[PDB]
Amino acid sequence: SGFRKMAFPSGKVEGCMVQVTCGTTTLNGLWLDDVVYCPRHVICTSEDMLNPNYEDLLIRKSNHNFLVQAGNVQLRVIGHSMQNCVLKLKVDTANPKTPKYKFVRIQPGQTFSVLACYNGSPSGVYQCAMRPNFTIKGSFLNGSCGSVGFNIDYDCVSFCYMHHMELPTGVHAGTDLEGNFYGPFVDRQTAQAAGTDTTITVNVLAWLYAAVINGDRWFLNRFTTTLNDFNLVAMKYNYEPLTQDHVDILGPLSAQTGIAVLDMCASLKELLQNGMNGRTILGSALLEDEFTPFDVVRQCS
Amino acid sequence: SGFRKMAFPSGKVEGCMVQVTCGTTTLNGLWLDDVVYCPRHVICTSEDMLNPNYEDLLIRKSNHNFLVQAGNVQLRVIGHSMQNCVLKLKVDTANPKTPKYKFVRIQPGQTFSVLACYNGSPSGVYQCAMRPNFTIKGSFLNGSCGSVGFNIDYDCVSFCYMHHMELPTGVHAGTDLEGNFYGPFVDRQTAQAAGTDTTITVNVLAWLYAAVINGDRWFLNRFTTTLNDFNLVAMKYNYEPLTQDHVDILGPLSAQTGIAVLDMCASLKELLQNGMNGRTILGSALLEDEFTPFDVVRQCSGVTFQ
Protein backbone atom coordinates (compact mmCIF):
# COMPACT_ATOMS: atom_id res chain seq x y z
CA SER A 1 0.00 0.00 0.00
CA GLY A 2 0.91 3.69 -0.09
CA PHE A 3 1.58 5.90 -3.09
CA ARG A 4 4.72 7.95 -3.62
CA LYS A 5 6.21 10.04 -6.38
CA MET A 6 8.90 7.38 -6.96
CA ALA A 7 12.03 7.95 -9.04
CA PHE A 8 14.04 5.28 -10.81
CA PRO A 9 17.22 4.08 -9.10
CA SER A 10 19.87 6.55 -10.20
CA GLY A 11 22.93 4.32 -10.10
CA LYS A 12 23.25 3.65 -13.82
CA VAL A 13 23.13 7.39 -14.48
CA GLU A 14 25.52 8.32 -11.65
CA GLY A 15 28.18 6.26 -13.44
CA CYS A 16 28.03 8.58 -16.47
CA MET A 17 28.03 12.01 -14.87
CA VAL A 18 31.14 14.11 -15.58
CA GLN A 19 32.21 17.75 -15.35
CA VAL A 20 32.85 19.85 -18.47
CA THR A 21 34.78 23.13 -18.32
CA CYS A 22 35.30 25.70 -21.07
CA GLY A 23 37.04 28.89 -19.96
CA THR A 24 35.28 30.08 -16.80
CA THR A 25 32.10 28.00 -17.35
CA THR A 26 31.67 24.62 -15.62
CA LEU A 27 28.63 22.37 -16.01
CA ASN A 28 27.67 18.70 -16.23
CA GLY A 29 28.14 16.28 -19.09
CA LEU A 30 26.83 12.80 -19.84
CA TRP A 31 29.62 10.30 -20.60
CA LEU A 32 28.36 7.39 -22.71
CA ASP A 33 30.83 5.13 -24.58
CA ASP A 34 33.53 7.52 -25.92
CA VAL A 35 31.28 10.61 -26.18
CA VAL A 36 30.51 13.33 -23.63
CA TYR A 37 27.22 15.22 -24.20
CA CYS A 38 26.63 18.65 -22.65
CA PRO A 39 24.80 21.89 -23.49
CA ARG A 40 26.56 23.88 -26.18
CA HIS A 41 26.18 27.11 -24.24
CA VAL A 42 29.15 25.89 -22.19
CA ILE A 43 31.11 27.77 -24.90
CA CYS A 44 29.38 31.13 -24.29
CA THR A 45 30.95 34.01 -22.38
CA SER A 46 28.99 36.79 -20.68
CA GLU A 47 28.86 38.74 -23.97
CA ASP A 48 27.37 35.87 -25.95
CA MET A 49 24.10 34.78 -24.34
CA LEU A 50 22.03 37.51 -26.05
CA ASN A 51 22.87 36.57 -29.66
CA PRO A 52 25.37 33.72 -29.62
CA ASN A 53 26.79 32.56 -32.93
CA TYR A 54 27.57 29.00 -31.86
CA GLU A 55 29.20 28.01 -35.16
CA ASP A 56 31.52 31.03 -34.87
CA LEU A 57 32.30 30.38 -31.19
CA LEU A 58 32.97 26.69 -31.77
CA ILE A 59 35.22 27.04 -34.84
CA ARG A 60 37.60 29.01 -32.57
CA LYS A 61 37.95 26.08 -30.14
CA SER A 62 40.38 23.19 -30.25
CA ASN A 63 40.06 19.91 -28.39
CA HIS A 64 42.35 20.97 -25.54
CA ASN A 65 40.08 23.96 -24.76
CA PHE A 66 37.59 21.51 -23.20
CA LEU A 67 38.43 20.06 -19.77
CA VAL A 68 36.46 16.90 -18.99
CA GLN A 69 36.79 15.50 -15.46
CA ALA A 70 35.36 12.13 -14.40
CA GLY A 71 35.76 11.71 -10.68
CA ASN A 72 39.24 13.13 -10.20
CA VAL A 73 40.55 11.58 -13.44
CA GLN A 74 40.88 13.98 -16.36
CA LEU A 75 39.57 12.72 -19.72
CA ARG A 76 41.32 13.86 -22.88
CA VAL A 77 39.13 15.27 -25.65
CA ILE A 78 40.03 14.11 -29.16
CA GLY A 79 37.16 15.57 -31.17
CA HIS A 80 34.19 17.86 -30.97
CA SER A 81 31.04 18.46 -32.97
CA MET A 82 27.72 20.20 -32.42
CA GLN A 83 24.34 18.53 -32.90
CA ASN A 84 21.50 21.03 -32.64
CA CYS A 85 21.89 22.48 -29.11
CA VAL A 86 24.18 19.81 -27.58
CA LEU A 87 27.96 19.60 -27.81
CA LYS A 88 29.42 16.13 -28.39
CA LEU A 89 32.98 15.77 -27.08
CA LYS A 90 34.82 12.68 -28.28
CA VAL A 91 37.14 11.42 -25.54
CA ASP A 92 40.00 8.93 -25.58
CA THR A 93 38.43 6.54 -23.04
CA ALA A 94 35.11 4.72 -23.30
CA ASN A 95 33.07 4.86 -20.11
CA PRO A 96 33.46 1.41 -18.52
CA LYS A 97 30.26 2.08 -16.53
CA THR A 98 28.20 2.73 -19.67
CA PRO A 99 24.78 1.10 -19.20
CA LYS A 100 22.47 -0.26 -21.84
CA TYR A 101 20.76 2.86 -23.11
CA LYS A 102 18.86 4.67 -25.84
CA PHE A 103 17.80 8.24 -26.58
CA VAL A 104 14.04 8.89 -26.60
CA ARG A 105 12.17 12.15 -27.19
CA ILE A 106 9.08 12.22 -24.96
CA GLN A 107 5.65 13.84 -25.32
CA PRO A 108 4.00 16.27 -22.90
CA GLY A 109 2.54 14.42 -19.94
CA GLN A 110 5.28 11.78 -19.88
CA THR A 111 7.25 11.43 -16.64
CA PHE A 112 10.90 10.76 -15.91
CA SER A 113 13.46 10.90 -13.12
CA VAL A 114 15.98 13.74 -12.85
CA LEU A 115 19.50 13.32 -11.48
CA ALA A 116 20.41 16.85 -10.42
CA CYS A 117 24.17 17.40 -10.53
CA TYR A 118 26.79 20.06 -9.82
CA ASN A 119 30.43 19.86 -10.95
CA GLY A 120 29.86 16.38 -12.39
CA SER A 121 28.77 15.15 -8.94
CA PRO A 122 25.19 13.94 -8.36
CA SER A 123 23.12 15.85 -5.79
CA GLY A 124 19.72 14.17 -5.69
CA VAL A 125 17.05 12.45 -7.72
CA TYR A 126 13.36 13.25 -8.10
CA GLN A 127 10.41 12.53 -10.39
CA CYS A 128 9.07 15.10 -12.91
CA ALA A 129 6.64 15.33 -15.80
CA MET A 130 6.97 17.14 -19.09
CA ARG A 131 4.23 19.79 -18.82
CA PRO A 132 1.88 20.56 -21.73
CA ASN A 133 3.76 23.84 -22.21
CA PHE A 134 6.97 21.79 -22.70
CA THR A 135 8.59 23.03 -19.48
CA ILE A 136 9.33 21.02 -16.37
CA LYS A 137 8.82 22.13 -12.77
CA GLY A 138 12.19 20.98 -11.47
CA SER A 139 14.63 21.94 -8.73
CA PHE A 140 17.86 23.31 -10.21
CA LEU A 141 20.46 25.78 -8.95
CA ASN A 142 23.27 27.48 -10.83
CA GLY A 143 25.69 24.83 -12.08
CA SER A 144 23.07 22.15 -12.76
CA CYS A 145 22.97 22.59 -16.56
CA GLY A 146 23.62 19.25 -18.20
CA SER A 147 21.69 17.30 -15.58
CA VAL A 148 19.68 14.64 -17.35
CA GLY A 149 16.27 13.03 -17.14
CA PHE A 150 15.65 9.36 -17.85
CA ASN A 151 13.50 6.30 -17.43
CA ILE A 152 14.83 2.80 -16.82
CA ASP A 153 13.10 -0.24 -18.26
CA TYR A 154 14.69 -3.67 -17.84
CA ASP A 155 18.17 -2.30 -17.08
CA CYS A 156 18.01 -0.13 -20.24
CA VAL A 157 18.23 3.61 -19.53
CA SER A 158 16.22 5.78 -21.93
CA PHE A 159 17.65 9.30 -21.73
CA CYS A 160 14.99 11.86 -22.57
CA TYR A 161 16.04 15.25 -21.18
CA MET A 162 19.10 17.39 -20.52
CA HIS A 163 18.76 20.63 -18.57
CA HIS A 164 19.67 23.90 -20.31
CA MET A 165 18.08 26.85 -18.47
CA GLU A 166 15.54 28.40 -16.10
CA LEU A 167 12.76 30.61 -17.45
CA PRO A 168 11.67 33.76 -15.56
CA THR A 169 8.73 31.99 -13.89
CA GLY A 170 11.03 29.50 -12.15
CA VAL A 171 10.31 26.56 -14.46
CA HIS A 172 12.95 24.81 -16.51
CA ALA A 173 13.64 24.08 -20.17
CA GLY A 174 15.92 21.64 -21.93
CA THR A 175 16.49 19.36 -24.92
CA ASP A 176 16.35 15.71 -25.79
CA LEU A 177 19.77 14.04 -26.08
CA GLU A 178 19.87 14.92 -29.77
CA GLY A 179 19.93 18.59 -28.81
CA ASN A 180 16.39 19.50 -29.92
CA PHE A 181 14.62 21.68 -27.36
CA TYR A 182 11.27 20.67 -25.98
CA GLY A 183 8.83 23.43 -26.90
CA PRO A 184 9.52 26.76 -28.57
CA PHE A 185 12.59 27.63 -26.48
CA VAL A 186 16.11 28.57 -27.63
CA ASP A 187 19.49 28.59 -25.86
CA ARG A 188 19.54 32.39 -25.95
CA GLN A 189 19.05 34.92 -23.17
CA THR A 190 16.12 36.47 -25.04
CA ALA A 191 12.70 37.33 -23.69
CA GLN A 192 10.91 34.00 -23.92
CA ALA A 193 8.16 32.81 -21.61
CA ALA A 194 6.37 29.50 -21.22
CA GLY A 195 2.86 29.19 -22.57
CA THR A 196 0.06 28.95 -20.02
CA ASP A 197 0.28 25.61 -18.31
CA THR A 198 -2.58 23.11 -18.23
CA THR A 199 -3.34 20.10 -16.08
CA ILE A 200 -2.50 16.73 -17.62
CA THR A 201 -6.02 15.28 -17.66
CA VAL A 202 -5.11 11.69 -18.54
CA ASN A 203 -2.66 11.57 -15.63
CA VAL A 204 -5.25 12.79 -13.12
CA LEU A 205 -7.62 10.04 -14.27
CA ALA A 206 -4.88 7.46 -13.78
CA TRP A 207 -4.15 8.82 -10.32
CA LEU A 208 -7.87 8.55 -9.55
CA TYR A 209 -7.84 4.92 -10.68
CA ALA A 210 -4.84 4.47 -8.38
CA ALA A 211 -6.89 5.80 -5.48
CA VAL A 212 -9.62 3.26 -6.20
CA ILE A 213 -7.01 0.50 -6.25
CA ASN A 214 -5.67 1.44 -2.80
CA GLY A 215 -9.28 1.21 -1.61
CA ASP A 216 -10.76 4.73 -1.80
CA ARG A 217 -14.09 5.32 -3.56
CA TRP A 218 -15.57 8.42 -1.89
CA PHE A 219 -15.28 10.60 -5.04
CA LEU A 220 -17.12 8.31 -7.46
CA ASN A 221 -20.70 9.11 -8.44
CA ARG A 222 -23.55 7.54 -10.42
CA PHE A 223 -23.18 9.78 -13.45
CA THR A 224 -21.42 9.28 -16.74
CA THR A 225 -20.47 11.70 -19.51
CA THR A 226 -19.78 11.87 -23.18
CA LEU A 227 -16.17 12.49 -24.20
CA ASN A 228 -16.97 15.88 -25.67
CA ASP A 229 -19.13 17.08 -22.77
CA PHE A 230 -16.27 16.15 -20.43
CA ASN A 231 -13.79 18.13 -22.55
CA LEU A 232 -16.08 21.18 -22.64
CA VAL A 233 -16.19 21.21 -18.82
CA ALA A 234 -12.54 20.35 -18.25
CA MET A 235 -11.13 23.05 -20.53
CA LYS A 236 -12.90 25.59 -18.32
CA TYR A 237 -10.56 24.47 -15.50
CA ASN A 238 -7.44 24.65 -17.72
CA TYR A 239 -7.33 20.85 -18.09
CA GLU A 240 -5.83 19.35 -21.23
CA PRO A 241 -8.27 17.89 -23.78
CA LEU A 242 -8.79 14.16 -23.32
CA THR A 243 -8.55 12.24 -26.59
CA GLN A 244 -9.62 8.78 -27.69
CA ASP A 245 -5.95 7.80 -27.40
CA HIS A 246 -6.07 8.78 -23.73
CA VAL A 247 -9.26 6.75 -23.32
CA ASP A 248 -7.62 3.66 -24.80
CA ILE A 249 -4.47 4.06 -22.67
CA LEU A 250 -6.69 3.95 -19.57
CA GLY A 251 -8.47 0.74 -20.66
CA PRO A 252 -6.40 -1.58 -18.45
CA LEU A 253 -6.90 0.49 -15.28
CA SER A 254 -10.60 0.67 -16.15
CA ALA A 255 -10.83 -3.14 -16.32
CA GLN A 256 -8.91 -3.73 -13.09
CA THR A 257 -11.30 -1.52 -11.07
CA GLY A 258 -14.53 -2.03 -13.02
CA ILE A 259 -15.07 1.72 -13.59
CA ALA A 260 -15.53 2.76 -17.23
CA VAL A 261 -13.25 5.59 -18.33
CA LEU A 262 -16.16 7.97 -19.01
CA ASP A 263 -17.55 7.18 -15.54
CA MET A 264 -14.25 8.20 -13.96
CA CYS A 265 -14.40 11.31 -16.15
CA ALA A 266 -17.78 12.06 -14.55
CA SER A 267 -16.16 11.72 -11.12
CA LEU A 268 -13.38 14.14 -12.13
CA LYS A 269 -16.00 16.61 -13.39
CA GLU A 270 -17.68 16.61 -9.98
CA LEU A 271 -14.36 16.86 -8.13
CA LEU A 272 -13.53 19.96 -10.19
CA GLN A 273 -16.91 21.44 -9.31
CA ASN A 274 -16.96 20.53 -5.61
CA GLY A 275 -13.35 20.51 -4.48
CA MET A 276 -12.37 17.86 -1.97
CA ASN A 277 -14.40 19.04 1.06
CA GLY A 278 -11.59 18.57 3.57
CA ARG A 279 -10.85 15.05 2.36
CA THR A 280 -7.68 13.89 0.63
CA ILE A 281 -6.94 11.45 -2.17
CA LEU A 282 -3.76 9.37 -1.81
CA GLY A 283 -2.69 11.91 0.80
CA SER A 284 -3.03 14.96 -1.47
CA ALA A 285 -5.47 17.88 -1.21
CA LEU A 286 -5.14 18.75 -4.92
CA LEU A 287 -5.67 16.65 -8.02
CA GLU A 288 -2.28 15.15 -8.91
CA ASP A 289 -1.20 15.00 -12.57
CA GLU A 290 2.43 13.78 -12.58
CA PHE A 291 1.70 10.03 -12.53
CA THR A 292 1.08 8.38 -15.89
CA PRO A 293 -1.15 5.38 -16.62
CA PHE A 294 2.09 3.41 -16.96
CA ASP A 295 3.46 4.73 -13.63
CA VAL A 296 0.25 3.80 -11.79
CA VAL A 297 0.36 0.20 -13.06
CA ARG A 298 4.05 0.08 -12.09
CA GLN A 299 3.71 1.16 -8.46
CA CYS A 300 0.24 -0.26 -7.65
CA SER A 301 -1.17 -3.82 -7.63
CA SER B 1 14.86 27.76 -8.22
CA GLY B 2 12.27 25.11 -7.48
CA PHE B 3 11.49 22.77 -4.61
CA ARG B 4 10.98 19.03 -4.99
CA LYS B 5 10.87 16.07 -2.59
CA MET B 6 14.35 14.93 -3.40
CA ALA B 7 16.07 11.63 -2.60
CA PHE B 8 19.77 10.94 -2.34
CA PRO B 9 21.40 9.25 -5.36
CA SER B 10 20.88 5.53 -4.77
CA GLY B 11 23.89 4.11 -6.63
CA LYS B 12 26.06 3.26 -3.62
CA VAL B 13 23.10 1.39 -2.10
CA GLU B 14 21.94 -0.32 -5.32
CA GLY B 15 25.27 -2.21 -5.29
CA CYS B 16 24.47 -3.81 -1.93
CA MET B 17 20.99 -5.23 -2.59
CA VAL B 18 20.73 -9.02 -2.86
CA GLN B 19 17.85 -11.49 -2.79
CA VAL B 20 17.57 -13.85 0.19
CA THR B 21 15.41 -16.98 0.09
CA CYS B 22 14.72 -19.36 2.97
CA GLY B 23 12.08 -21.86 1.90
CA THR B 24 9.19 -20.26 0.06
CA THR B 25 9.65 -16.84 1.72
CA THR B 26 11.91 -14.64 -0.40
CA LEU B 27 12.85 -11.03 0.38
CA ASN B 28 15.68 -8.50 0.06
CA GLY B 29 19.04 -8.48 1.81
CA LEU B 30 21.75 -5.86 2.34
CA TRP B 31 25.23 -7.13 1.46
CA LEU B 32 28.11 -5.29 3.12
CA ASP B 33 31.62 -6.79 3.28
CA ASP B 34 31.00 -10.53 3.91
CA VAL B 35 27.68 -10.21 5.79
CA VAL B 36 24.13 -10.08 4.42
CA TYR B 37 21.59 -8.29 6.63
CA CYS B 38 17.87 -9.03 6.28
CA PRO B 39 14.73 -9.30 8.45
CA ARG B 40 14.78 -12.31 10.75
CA HIS B 41 11.20 -13.18 9.79
CA VAL B 42 12.57 -14.70 6.55
CA ILE B 43 12.85 -18.00 8.45
CA CYS B 44 9.16 -18.14 9.39
CA THR B 45 6.23 -19.79 7.66
CA SER B 46 2.76 -18.26 7.80
CA GLU B 47 2.06 -20.75 10.60
CA ASP B 48 5.24 -19.72 12.43
CA MET B 49 4.50 -16.01 11.93
CA LEU B 50 1.64 -16.10 14.47
CA ASN B 51 3.80 -16.92 17.49
CA PRO B 52 7.43 -17.45 16.46
CA ASN B 53 10.24 -18.56 18.73
CA TYR B 54 13.08 -17.14 16.71
CA GLU B 55 16.14 -18.70 18.36
CA ASP B 56 14.45 -22.11 18.37
CA LEU B 57 13.46 -21.65 14.71
CA LEU B 58 17.01 -20.45 14.00
CA ILE B 59 18.77 -23.27 15.88
CA ARG B 60 17.07 -25.69 13.46
CA LYS B 61 18.01 -23.87 10.24
CA SER B 62 21.46 -24.48 8.78
CA ASN B 63 23.69 -22.45 6.44
CA HIS B 64 22.57 -24.34 3.32
CA ASN B 65 18.92 -23.35 4.04
CA PHE B 66 19.72 -19.74 2.99
CA LEU B 67 19.78 -19.04 -0.75
CA VAL B 68 21.55 -15.70 -1.34
CA GLN B 69 21.45 -14.27 -4.87
CA ALA B 70 23.65 -11.31 -5.84
CA GLY B 71 22.19 -10.61 -9.25
CA ASN B 72 22.83 -13.89 -11.07
CA VAL B 73 25.72 -15.11 -8.89
CA GLN B 74 24.87 -17.26 -5.89
CA LEU B 75 26.62 -16.35 -2.66
CA ARG B 76 27.36 -19.23 -0.32
CA VAL B 77 26.30 -18.84 3.31
CA ILE B 78 29.01 -19.94 5.76
CA GLY B 79 27.40 -18.58 8.93
CA HIS B 80 24.17 -17.29 10.47
CA SER B 81 23.48 -15.22 13.58
CA MET B 82 20.77 -12.95 14.86
CA GLN B 83 21.05 -9.42 16.29
CA ASN B 84 17.69 -8.24 17.64
CA CYS B 85 15.23 -8.40 14.74
CA VAL B 86 17.70 -8.73 11.84
CA LEU B 87 19.49 -11.88 10.68
CA LYS B 88 23.19 -11.71 9.83
CA LEU B 89 24.32 -14.15 7.14
CA LYS B 90 28.09 -14.43 6.90
CA VAL B 91 28.93 -15.20 3.28
CA ASP B 92 32.01 -16.51 1.52
CA THR B 93 32.62 -13.40 -0.65
CA ALA B 94 33.05 -9.81 0.48
CA ASN B 95 30.99 -7.36 -1.56
CA PRO B 96 33.42 -5.52 -3.88
CA LYS B 97 30.96 -2.60 -4.11
CA THR B 98 30.79 -2.14 -0.34
CA PRO B 99 30.66 1.66 0.12
CA LYS B 100 31.99 3.49 3.12
CA TYR B 101 29.11 3.26 5.58
CA LYS B 102 27.73 3.45 9.12
CA PHE B 103 24.66 2.10 10.88
CA VAL B 104 22.79 4.98 12.53
CA ARG B 105 19.45 5.30 14.31
CA ILE B 106 17.38 8.33 13.36
CA GLN B 107 14.91 10.41 15.36
CA PRO B 108 11.23 11.02 14.57
CA GLY B 109 11.03 13.98 12.23
CA GLN B 110 14.33 13.24 10.49
CA THR B 111 14.14 12.20 6.83
CA PHE B 112 15.81 9.53 4.72
CA SER B 113 15.74 7.98 1.25
CA VAL B 114 14.23 4.54 0.67
CA LEU B 115 15.40 2.21 -2.09
CA ALA B 116 12.37 -0.02 -2.66
CA CYS B 117 13.35 -3.49 -3.93
CA TYR B 118 11.75 -6.75 -5.05
CA ASN B 119 13.71 -10.03 -5.31
CA GLY B 120 16.89 -8.13 -4.49
CA SER B 121 16.30 -5.91 -7.53
CA PRO B 122 15.92 -2.16 -6.84
CA SER B 123 12.90 -0.65 -8.53
CA GLY B 124 12.40 2.83 -7.05
CA VAL B 125 13.74 5.48 -4.70
CA TYR B 126 11.81 8.04 -2.68
CA GLN B 127 12.23 10.37 0.29
CA CYS B 128 10.52 9.70 3.64
CA ALA B 129 10.32 11.02 7.20
CA MET B 130 10.19 8.97 10.37
CA ARG B 131 6.80 10.07 11.72
CA PRO B 132 6.39 11.01 15.40
CA ASN B 133 4.42 7.77 15.80
CA PHE B 134 7.48 5.92 14.41
CA THR B 135 5.86 4.78 11.16
CA ILE B 136 6.74 5.87 7.64
CA LYS B 137 4.30 6.56 4.82
CA GLY B 138 6.14 4.55 2.18
CA SER B 139 5.01 2.73 -0.94
CA PHE B 140 5.63 -1.00 -0.55
CA LEU B 141 4.01 -4.08 -2.06
CA ASN B 142 4.66 -7.67 -1.02
CA GLY B 143 8.29 -8.70 -1.49
CA SER B 144 9.55 -5.27 -0.37
CA CYS B 145 10.77 -6.51 3.06
CA GLY B 146 14.48 -5.89 3.44
CA SER B 147 14.36 -2.56 1.57
CA VAL B 148 16.57 0.02 3.24
CA GLY B 149 16.56 3.70 4.16
CA PHE B 150 19.71 5.81 4.15
CA ASN B 151 21.28 9.26 4.10
CA ILE B 152 24.57 10.19 2.40
CA ASP B 153 27.07 12.61 3.97
CA TYR B 154 30.31 13.25 2.04
CA ASP B 155 31.25 9.76 0.75
CA CYS B 156 29.60 7.81 3.55
CA VAL B 157 26.23 6.02 3.41
CA SER B 158 24.42 6.17 6.76
CA PHE B 159 21.97 3.26 6.89
CA CYS B 160 19.04 3.98 9.19
CA TYR B 161 16.08 1.76 8.26
CA MET B 162 15.11 -1.65 6.97
CA HIS B 163 11.55 -2.54 6.06
CA HIS B 164 9.75 -5.29 7.99
CA MET B 165 6.00 -4.91 7.76
CA GLU B 166 2.90 -2.98 6.76
CA LEU B 167 0.24 -1.84 9.23
CA PRO B 168 -3.53 -1.92 8.58
CA THR B 169 -3.67 1.83 7.94
CA GLY B 170 -1.33 1.33 4.97
CA VAL B 171 1.77 2.81 6.65
CA HIS B 172 5.01 0.93 7.29
CA ALA B 173 7.24 -0.21 10.15
CA GLY B 174 10.84 -1.36 10.33
CA THR B 175 14.05 -1.53 12.33
CA ASP B 176 17.42 0.09 12.35
CA LEU B 177 20.24 -1.96 10.90
CA GLU B 178 21.08 -3.28 14.37
CA GLY B 179 17.61 -4.84 14.46
CA ASN B 180 15.81 -2.53 16.90
CA PHE B 181 12.30 -1.57 15.85
CA TYR B 182 11.22 1.99 15.35
CA GLY B 183 8.16 2.28 17.55
CA PRO B 184 6.23 -0.25 19.65
CA PHE B 185 6.03 -2.98 17.01
CA VAL B 186 6.94 -6.68 17.01
CA ASP B 187 7.73 -9.00 14.10
CA ARG B 188 4.79 -11.37 14.45
CA GLN B 189 1.44 -11.48 12.72
CA THR B 190 -0.56 -9.96 15.60
CA ALA B 191 -3.02 -7.07 15.91
CA GLN B 192 -0.85 -3.95 15.63
CA ALA B 193 -1.88 -0.37 14.90
CA ALA B 194 -0.18 2.95 14.34
CA GLY B 195 -0.80 5.38 17.17
CA THR B 196 -2.22 8.82 16.50
CA ASP B 197 0.25 10.87 14.48
CA THR B 198 1.22 14.50 14.88
CA THR B 199 2.68 17.06 12.51
CA ILE B 200 6.41 17.83 12.69
CA THR B 201 6.36 21.54 13.53
CA VAL B 202 10.04 22.35 12.94
CA ASN B 203 9.76 20.78 9.47
CA VAL B 204 6.70 22.85 8.52
CA LEU B 205 8.61 25.99 9.47
CA ALA B 206 11.62 24.85 7.43
CA TRP B 207 9.30 24.37 4.46
CA LEU B 208 7.76 27.81 4.97
CA TYR B 209 11.32 29.16 4.80
CA ALA B 210 11.82 27.25 1.55
CA ALA B 211 8.68 28.95 0.25
CA VAL B 212 10.05 32.38 1.15
CA ILE B 213 13.38 31.54 -0.50
CA ASN B 214 11.39 30.58 -3.62
CA GLY B 215 9.22 33.72 -3.72
CA ASP B 216 6.07 32.58 -1.86
CA ARG B 217 5.66 35.41 0.65
CA TRP B 218 1.91 35.96 1.01
CA PHE B 219 1.60 34.35 4.48
CA LEU B 220 4.19 36.59 6.16
CA ASN B 221 2.71 39.23 8.48
CA ARG B 222 3.83 42.02 10.80
CA PHE B 223 3.37 39.98 13.96
CA THR B 224 5.62 37.96 16.22
CA THR B 225 4.99 35.65 19.17
CA THR B 226 6.73 33.62 21.85
CA LEU B 227 7.60 29.96 22.16
CA ASN B 228 5.09 29.51 25.01
CA ASP B 229 2.17 31.14 23.20
CA PHE B 230 2.80 29.28 19.94
CA ASN B 231 3.14 25.84 21.55
CA LEU B 232 -0.36 26.20 22.98
CA VAL B 233 -1.52 26.70 19.40
CA ALA B 234 0.57 23.73 18.25
CA MET B 235 -0.92 21.38 20.83
CA LYS B 236 -4.44 22.46 19.83
CA TYR B 237 -3.87 21.64 16.15
CA ASN B 238 -2.05 18.35 16.82
CA TYR B 239 1.44 19.69 16.05
CA GLU B 240 4.56 18.62 17.91
CA PRO B 241 5.82 21.11 20.51
CA LEU B 242 8.48 23.53 19.31
CA THR B 243 11.58 23.52 21.51
CA GLN B 244 14.35 26.07 21.87
CA ASP B 245 16.56 23.47 20.19
CA HIS B 246 14.28 23.59 17.14
CA VAL B 247 14.56 27.40 17.04
CA ASP B 248 18.36 27.20 17.13
CA ILE B 249 18.28 24.74 14.21
CA LEU B 250 16.14 27.11 12.12
CA GLY B 251 18.72 29.88 12.68
CA PRO B 252 20.52 29.57 9.33
CA LEU B 253 17.17 30.02 7.56
CA SER B 254 15.93 32.86 9.78
CA ALA B 255 19.08 34.85 9.07
CA GLN B 256 19.22 33.90 5.39
CA THR B 257 15.69 35.21 4.76
CA GLY B 258 15.29 37.92 7.38
CA ILE B 259 12.29 36.28 9.05
CA ALA B 260 12.88 35.32 12.67
CA VAL B 261 11.65 31.93 13.83
CA LEU B 262 9.04 33.30 16.23
CA ASP B 263 8.22 35.73 13.41
CA MET B 264 7.60 32.74 11.13
CA CYS B 265 5.68 30.90 13.87
CA ALA B 266 3.37 33.92 13.81
CA SER B 267 2.71 33.09 10.15
CA LEU B 268 2.22 29.40 10.93
CA LYS B 269 -0.06 30.33 13.83
CA GLU B 270 -2.31 32.31 11.44
CA LEU B 271 -2.16 29.52 8.85
CA LEU B 272 -3.36 26.99 11.42
CA GLN B 273 -6.09 29.31 12.70
CA ASN B 274 -7.40 30.92 9.46
CA GLY B 275 -6.50 28.36 6.79
CA MET B 276 -5.02 28.96 3.34
CA ASN B 277 -7.94 31.00 1.92
CA GLY B 278 -7.64 29.53 -1.57
CA ARG B 279 -3.90 30.07 -2.03
CA THR B 280 -1.15 27.47 -2.23
CA ILE B 281 2.36 27.32 -0.80
CA LEU B 282 4.98 25.71 -3.07
CA GLY B 283 2.18 24.18 -5.12
CA SER B 284 0.59 22.50 -2.09
CA ALA B 285 -2.70 23.05 -0.30
CA LEU B 286 -1.37 21.15 2.73
CA LEU B 287 1.38 22.20 5.13
CA GLU B 288 4.31 19.90 4.22
CA ASP B 289 6.21 18.45 7.18
CA GLU B 290 8.66 16.00 5.55
CA PHE B 291 11.54 18.42 4.82
CA THR B 292 14.04 18.95 7.63
CA PRO B 293 15.83 22.27 8.09
CA PHE B 294 18.93 20.61 6.68
CA ASP B 295 16.93 19.37 3.68
CA VAL B 296 15.81 22.92 2.90
CA VAL B 297 19.30 24.36 3.27
CA ARG B 298 20.97 21.61 1.24
CA GLN B 299 18.48 21.82 -1.64
CA CYS B 300 18.65 25.65 -1.57
CA SER B 301 22.47 25.66 -1.52
CA GLY B 302 23.62 22.87 -3.85
CA VAL B 303 25.54 20.21 -1.91
CA THR B 304 26.72 17.26 -4.03
CA PHE B 305 28.04 13.80 -3.08
CA GLN B 306 30.02 12.00 -5.80
Ligand SMILES: Oc1cncc(Cl)c1
Ligand atom coordinates in the same frame (compact mmCIF):
# COMPACT_ATOMS: atom_id res chain seq x y z
O1 LIG C 1 21.95 27.83 -14.92
C1 LIG C 1 20.79 27.55 -14.17
C2 LIG C 1 20.06 26.39 -14.39
N1 LIG C 1 18.96 26.10 -13.71
C3 LIG C 1 18.52 26.92 -12.78
C4 LIG C 1 19.18 28.09 -12.49
CL1 LIG C 1 18.57 29.19 -11.23
C5 LIG C 1 20.33 28.42 -13.20
Ligand SMILES: Oc1cncc(Cl)c1
Ligand atom coordinates in the same frame (compact mmCIF):
# COMPACT_ATOMS: atom_id res chain seq x y z
O1 LIG D 1 5.05 -8.15 3.02
C1 LIG D 1 4.71 -6.80 2.89
C2 LIG D 1 5.51 -5.81 3.44
N1 LIG D 1 5.21 -4.52 3.34
C3 LIG D 1 4.13 -4.13 2.69
C4 LIG D 1 3.28 -5.06 2.12
CL1 LIG D 1 1.81 -4.51 1.25
C5 LIG D 1 3.57 -6.41 2.21
Ligand code: NA
Ligand atom coordinates in the same frame (compact mmCIF):
# COMPACT_ATOMS: atom_id res chain seq x y z
NA1 NA E 1 5.03 37.69 11.12
